[PDB]
Write a protein that binds this ligand. Structure first.
Ligand SMILES: Cn1c(=O)c2c(ncn2C)n(C)c1=O
Lengths: 41, 241
């Protein structure tokens, strides 16, 4: 799952993808905002 | 305390309480003198160290006055004055670390001063011990503390800074950050190392960078910047903790 991090429809049957932006806001200001968001998408 | 057997008597513990009150007031005005110029000569330092030794000694007496759980000793101390003198001590320490955070001149007296804080709080916890439910004397101590809570902040967060930043300096923006890891890491090297950490305020980390003392070009030692007193400071903060 180190290779599923960037994947597009990431919770394709789970819940919601807004959690990705949520944890970007948990962490991207600390380390890389545009780096880790692009690492997700 | 009591000296019951004679006709008349005294309570010598109250006498030493007021003596250290006078001592406290003297040291506080010494601070008030030095609080403006802040370029402190040899003389005031070396006599001040002797005054520090007095404070150390009288706290040693105080501790051994409550060496055991001697109760009426604690009762007199609960009704004693001394808490305000402690408050003024905290007030001294709060600004005192910051002026003493600079030079080779400073660090000796700073070491003695933080030593004195450690002994004072040792005195405090030693008289603390006899509590049961929440501690009436402990309630009194809460009154003293959260009364003087503001100057507690400076010393405690100073401890936090010096502790966590001797802790950070291992690696992963430090040891690999140069080849050797001696401390040829430059000033702004460490500054942006802190920025990449993004843990602390920029103000006090760059204040630490002001106390990095400019290792002849830009660099900064690992231990000799912080650790050599920070682990003493770790002991002290352990006591207060
Ligand atoms: C999208 N979503 C949720 O977000 C969710 C949930 N149960 C709890 N949450 C929070 N279910 C069933 C769900 O479908």
């Amino acid at each position: 799952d180190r290779l599923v991090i960037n994947t597009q429809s990431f919770p394709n049957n789970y819940w919601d993808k807004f959690v990705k932006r949520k944890v970007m806001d948990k962490y991207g200001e600390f380390y890389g905002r545009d780096r880790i968001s692009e690492l997700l998408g | 305390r009591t000296q019951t057997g004679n006709n008349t008597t005294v309570n010598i513990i109250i006498s030493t309480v007021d003596y250290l009150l006078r001592v406290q007031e003297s040291i506080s005005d010494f601070y008030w003198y030095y609080s403006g110029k802040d370029v402190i000569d040899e003389q005031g330092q070396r006599n001040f160290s002797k005054a520090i030794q007095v404070a150390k000694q009288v706290f040693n007496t105080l501790t051994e006055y409550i060496q055991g759980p001697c109760t009426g000793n604690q009762q007199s101390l609960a009704h004693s004055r001394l808490w305000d003198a402690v408050v003024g001590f905290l007030h001294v320490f709060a600004h005192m670390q910051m002026k003493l955070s600079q030079d080779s001149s400073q660090i000796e007296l700073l070491k003695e001063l933080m030593d004195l804080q450690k002994d004072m709080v040792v005195m405090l916890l030693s008289m603390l011990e006899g509590n049961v439910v929440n501690g009436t004397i402990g309630k009194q101590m809460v009154d003293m503390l959260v009364e003087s809570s503001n100057n507690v902040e400076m010393i405690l967060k100073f401890f936090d800074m010096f502790l966590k930043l001797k802790d950070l300096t291992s690696s992963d923006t430090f040891k690999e950050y140069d080849p050797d890891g001696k401390g040829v890491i430059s000033k702004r090297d460490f500054h942006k190392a802190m920025e990449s950490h993004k843990h602390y305020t920029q103000s006090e980390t760059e204040f630490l960078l002001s106390c990095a003392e400019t290792d002849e070009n830009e660099t900064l030692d690992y231990e000799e910047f912080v650790k050599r007193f920070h682990e003493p400071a770790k002991d002290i903060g352990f006591n207060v903790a």
